[PDB]
Structures are given as C-alpha cells and as structure tokens.
Design goal:
The structure is cut from a larger assembly and holds 3 copies of chain A.
Chain A lengths: L19 H4 L26
PDB class: membrane protein/immune system
Keywords: ACE2-B0AT1 complex, membrane protein, MEMBRANE PROTEIN-IMMUNE SYSTEM complex
Entry title: S protein of SARS-CoV-2 in complex bound with 4A8
C-alpha cells in the first residue's frame, strides 16, 4: 500500500459490484458508512467509485 | 374590443392566486438542511434511525 | 428485564440503541427506543 502523504487513488467503472462480500467477510476493525446504509448498497447504482 | 388592460382589476386576482400556487410547488425542491430534497432517495439509502 | 451474557471488549460498542454491526444485526439487537442502563466489566481473569 502507499504512504499516507502519497495515497494511491484509482477509479472503478463499468462493473457489477457486490458490497455484501466486503461486508460479511469480517476481517475489518472499523467499517462505517456516511450518508449510505451498509445494507442498502446491494441496491444502489452509482456513476463512479 | 381594442384596448387591453380594460379588465386589469380582474387579472390581478388571477395573477395573485397563481403566483401563490406556483411558489407552493417550487418549495418542494428545497432541502431545508437535509441531504436531499426528494423523500424517496433518503428512504432508498438510509436506516430508519 | 435483566439480560445477561458474555462478549469480548471489541464488541462492547455493539450494545447501544440503534446501530448495526456483528452482534447487533445477528445476536443481541436493541430497539431504538430507550432501554435503561447498560453495565459492563471485564472477565479476563475471572471466567477465562
């Protein structure tokens, strides 16, 4: 991974993402959302991540 | 048959009544502080708390 | 009502009214409204 002052940034487009396999695969200390609920990400449909 | 604004007293009560109903619909697109001005979109992406 | 159970210390934030997580979505779920008081202490050298 990159350094905090030199943080890597990439773009996600044109895919069928699945956020349930990021949510339920529990290996994470903090997992919090802002303005979105974590369970409704299965239904949402975005322009860019 | 020729001179317009011969009935300018009756046109005002139509213009006043329509400008008020016009401003009532246009206040449905304000946020008033929230993240969205549309009620379906905060029910499609947030938890009931 | 006094409900008694054991968890670890990482999941002690999961017991509060109205939030998600591992315990709250599948085990002990507290309704939004108030319950009362929530009391906790350590059992490292008492029961383990």
């Amino acid at each position: 991974f990159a350094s905090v002052y030199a943080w890597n940034r990439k773009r996600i487009s044109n895919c069928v993402a699945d956020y349930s396999v990021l949510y339920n695969s529990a290996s994470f200390s903090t997992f919090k959302c802002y303005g979105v609920s974590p369970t409704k990400l299965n239904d949402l449909c975005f322009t860019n991540v | 048959s020729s001179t317009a604004s011969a009935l300018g007293k009756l046109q005002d009560v139509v213009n006043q009544n329509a400008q008020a109903l016009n401003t009532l619909v246009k206040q449905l697109s304000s946020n008033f502080g929230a993240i969205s001005s549309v009620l379906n979109d905060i029910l499609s992406r947030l938890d009931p708390p | 009502y006094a409900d008694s159970f054991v968890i670890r210390g990482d999941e002690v934030r999961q017991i509060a009214p109205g939030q998600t997580g591992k315990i709250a979505d599948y085990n002990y779920k507290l309704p939004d409204d108030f319950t009362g008081c929530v009391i906790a202490w350590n059992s490292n050298n008492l029961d383990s």
